[PDB]
Amino acid sequence: MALLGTILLPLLGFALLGLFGKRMREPLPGVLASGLVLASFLLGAGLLLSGGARFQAEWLPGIPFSLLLDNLSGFMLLIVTGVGFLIHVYAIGYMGGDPGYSRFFAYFNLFIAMMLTLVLADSYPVMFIGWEGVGLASFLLIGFWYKNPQYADSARKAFIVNRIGDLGFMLGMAILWALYGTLSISELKEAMEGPLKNPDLLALAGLLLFLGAVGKSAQIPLMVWLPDAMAGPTPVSALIHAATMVTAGVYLIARSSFLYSVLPDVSYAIAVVGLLTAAYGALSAFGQTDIKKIVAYSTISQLGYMFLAAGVGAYWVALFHVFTHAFFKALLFLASGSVIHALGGEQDVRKMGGLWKHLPQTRWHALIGALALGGLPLLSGFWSKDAILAATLTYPFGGVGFYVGALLVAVLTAMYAMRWFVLVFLGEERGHHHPHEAPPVMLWPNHLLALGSVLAGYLALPHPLPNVLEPFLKPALAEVEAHHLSLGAEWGLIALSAAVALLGLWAGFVFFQRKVFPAWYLAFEAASREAFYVDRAYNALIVNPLKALAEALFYGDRGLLSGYFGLGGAARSLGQGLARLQTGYLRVYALLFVLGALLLLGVMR
């Protein structure tokens, strides 16, 4: 019951800031929200340290309300609460002079409470409640400044894609109800081991669940909806791309590990899609001329990395990548937000350059972030990315091409991170920033974020060094493991990863300081800027034809109603043809009389 108050708090907060909301001074919404986030972090750490929590309440007949707080749930809870409070303070700073402060923080409280309801769940319906609640809050916050049509269609497309994924989720849930009749991950898992039945149906439910996960974490083909989330405020974009709404997909695989571990083709396909998403994000990142989108495509590549990890069965390794990511991508995004808060929201790259010397305490933040994303050999991202690279080979499903693929992806991530950093801070001088670039309580929580990013790190280390997260995560759930490993050659692989990351950093350094940009590279960069002409096709044969069929079926309904009118008109026409039978000459009336009487007398036999 105390576990439920953690979620109840950012409901009272949201109700206050939504109903009355602007009846408070400017700093207050952040104060209340941050207090609720911190008092949920505290009461969740206290419960987890106390061994765990369980709560059951009455709901739909056969479908009760089950909350389960274990190691895997508390891990996500602590992550989300800490990053959310840090982004809450950074938003207290960054939101200034903007109306809707209460709107902002009420949506924040709603987001946090719904994400907690999502992860803290023993029943799939509650997971889906959290899913659609997160989609709602995200669609709301992306369109926070609603006066712009440009930043409305973004959230529109976002929630449509989200609901496509959620429909896939609903169909998988209906499948896992028809078969067993439980739909509670605990008892469904305890009943699903042993006599598996209709393996086609099990793999199908897994396929639809993964389809929902793709929409949630913006994988192929639903990839396109994430970059437009640049429209939302920067702390919103951090919360959506780093701590929440993307971890839901990998967490679904982490909780359904019992299902996906007995599905070799399904897990192989999940790894394939993770690799494809990583490649797409990496290839199309640097061509993007906007800071937010060039970071969003890196988010795409990193989520592809995480799905690759969770695809081969490296669930604890995928959660390692999730931990590292939650640190460094929040660093990146809050850095970009302080940057455009210094330049008055200019929000471009080609209109940037030479911000290195100008900016104290910001070049350090951006450099730390760019190194973690590129995987600086001594940084958390390095451990996570190379643990995934190894788990590719060691864990099942083969990992043959995926290893060299992810290695080249590391090259490209380093390259585009260097492009970002150079074109934003080096190699020209443009624009204006006089008065106030560095804020206290904006760069201060970013300080703690960057520090943790540097030292997230060594919780998961190759087997000579302590792997702290594996024994914490494995016993509660994700129980099954079957993987080879080696030594000496594995550290040679670590050395290959470190060398590749450094060579990619310097390769981006030279290529993006050069300004040579050869003929083929210019076309490549242009195509990458337009996201490889994906949206043109997406609006070509699906969306615009859906509009066309809406219009055509409206025409068809018009014609159906006209046909009913034609029935009425046939009735009246038949009526007047029978009415014209009464001419008025008495001889006609007597003839028809005698005819009818004869007919009647004939029928009587």
Binding site: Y146, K147, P149, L171, A550
Partner: protein, 467 residues
């Protein structure tokens, strides 16, 4: 007892039509709400307040009334919805008495314990609707009226022969549903009676090829949408299916199940899809109501007591929030004067809390979890997938088009660039919004508490389709 709760809206509507003043009808609807909620509590079962009186002893007709669990929450739904529509109305055309009359009639209709009384109210409810439609607005008012009335009547009048057959061919002593259920109809005789039931109930469900009465009906009513709210409450078809049509003639329904599920799925998809092309509020909401009836028909036709209870719960809540959206559109019309979705875009900045109310109502519309629509929607998915996976899957390419049309209309109406600025909120709209969202949250968050009484009926009448 039940009789008083049923009659109170009728007599208060009389005292509004013949007597004065306008305001007393609001408190009459409130008193109905209170009494229907009280009768909803302490409910032991069907016998709750049993009432038996003779109507045609020689023919076998009795005034037969009582509260099921289904009748209880439907009483609550109607009383609440009509009271909201009474306070916020702003119609003031001196016809709210007709709306209270229709409320009492629908209450008696759901309280029908014998078949003929159900049929009687089913036919009688044609009068208010046509009146408040005809003399209170619309250019093609008489023509859309003739369309709707001819549809309903062509469907209904052969159903009278159907009910005469159901009484006579089973040798039932009276029209009581208890007795008629005790004497089932035999093969090659339940066929025709169920077919007569299915035409009359489908044309009023409404289903795809027969939905043509709904947009013209909803457009030409009083633009405040009170008549539209009650007409949306007039889609009671599904109920009669589950309670009357199927149990009384399941033999033909056994064969017609595939076609009925197909109609339900195709209706849902077509409505939620064409709602996108709708350029106006009445057409959009008409197609939405058609979608909801398609999903409810799917849930009922699927068997699967899960799907049956879900379809009924979805039907009740969908009536609620669709009437709410109609009243919201009527209030924005009264303060603006136009229902176009394109024009008057800036509303959200001028309207502080009307946008959030419209958003909550729309979210419940597209079936967002945490509101009343999601329990029934998902239970219907489960039951239909049990019945036919293909039809539930196709039919549920609906949340996509649902989200599309709801968010498109909400954005292009409220969120975009500011216009002149529009009236914010009325004093009655305050209690209206408060109670509406309160009910939505309570019925969506705790579908455990409600819908418990729906489970025994559902499981028994679904196993009836078994061995």
């Amino acid at each position: 007892m039940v009789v008083l709760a049923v009659l109170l809206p009728v007599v208060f509507g009389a005292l509004l039509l013949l007597g004065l003043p306008r305001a007393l009808g609001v408190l009459g609807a409130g008193l109905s709400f209170l009494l229907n909620l009280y009768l909803f509590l302490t409910h032991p079962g069907g016998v709750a307040h049993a009432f038996q009186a003779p109507l045609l002893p020689g023919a076998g007709v009795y005034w037969a009334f009582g509260l099921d669990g289904l009748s209880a929450l439907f009483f609550l739904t109607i009383a609440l919805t009509v009271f909201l529509g009474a306070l916020v109305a702003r119609v003031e055309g001196r016809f709210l008495g007709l709306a209270l009359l229709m409320e009492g009639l629908l209450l008696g209709l759901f309280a029908a314990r014998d078949l003929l009384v159900f049929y009687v109210f089913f036919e009688a409810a044609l009068i208010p609707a046509l009146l408040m439609l005809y003399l209170y607005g619309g250019e093609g008012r008489t023509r859309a009226l003739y369309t709707f009335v001819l549809f309903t009547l062509v469907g209904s009048l052969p159903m009278l022969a159907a009910v005469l057959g159901a009484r006579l061919l089973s040798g039932s002593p009276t029209f009581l549903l208890e007795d008629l259920l005790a004497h089932p109809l035999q093969e090659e005789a339940a066929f025709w009676v169920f077919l007569g039931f299915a035409l009359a109930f489908a044309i009023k469900t409404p289903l795809f090829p027969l939905h043509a009465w709904l947009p013209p009906f909803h457009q030409e009513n009083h633009p405040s949408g009170l008549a539209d709210a009650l007409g949306t409450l007039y889609k009671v078809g599904v109920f009669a299916f589950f309670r009357f049509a199927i149990p009384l003639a399941p033999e033909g329904f056994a064969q017609a199940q595939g076609l009925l599920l197909f109609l339900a799925a195709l209706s849902a998809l077509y409505g939620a899809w064409v709602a996108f092309a709708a350029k106006d509020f009445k057409t959009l909401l008409a197609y939405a109501g058609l979608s909801h009836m398609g999903v409810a028909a799917l849930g009922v036709f699927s068997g699967t007591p899960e799907g049956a209870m879900g379809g009924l719960y979805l039907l009740a809540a969908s009536g609620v929030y669709t009437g709410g959206l109609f009243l919201l559109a009527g209030r924005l019309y009264e303060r603006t004067g136009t229902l176009e979705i394109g024009r008057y875009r800036g509303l959200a900045q001028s309207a502080p809390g009307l946008a959030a109310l419209a958003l909550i109502l729309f979210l419940a519309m597209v079936g967002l979890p945490g509101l009343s629509g999601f329990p029934g929607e998902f239970l219907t998915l489960l039951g239909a997938y049990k019945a036919s996976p293909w039809l539930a899957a196709l039919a549920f390419l609906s949340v996509i088009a649902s989200a599309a049309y709801a968010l498109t209309a909400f954005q292009k109406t409220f969120w975009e660039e500011g216009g002149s600025g529009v009236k914010d909120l009325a004093g009655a709209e305050w209690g209206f919004a408060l109670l509406s969202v309160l009910a939505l949250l309570l019925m969506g968050v705790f579908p455990g508490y409600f819908a418990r009484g729906l489970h025994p009926l559902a499981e028994a009448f679904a196993k009836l389709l078994g061995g």
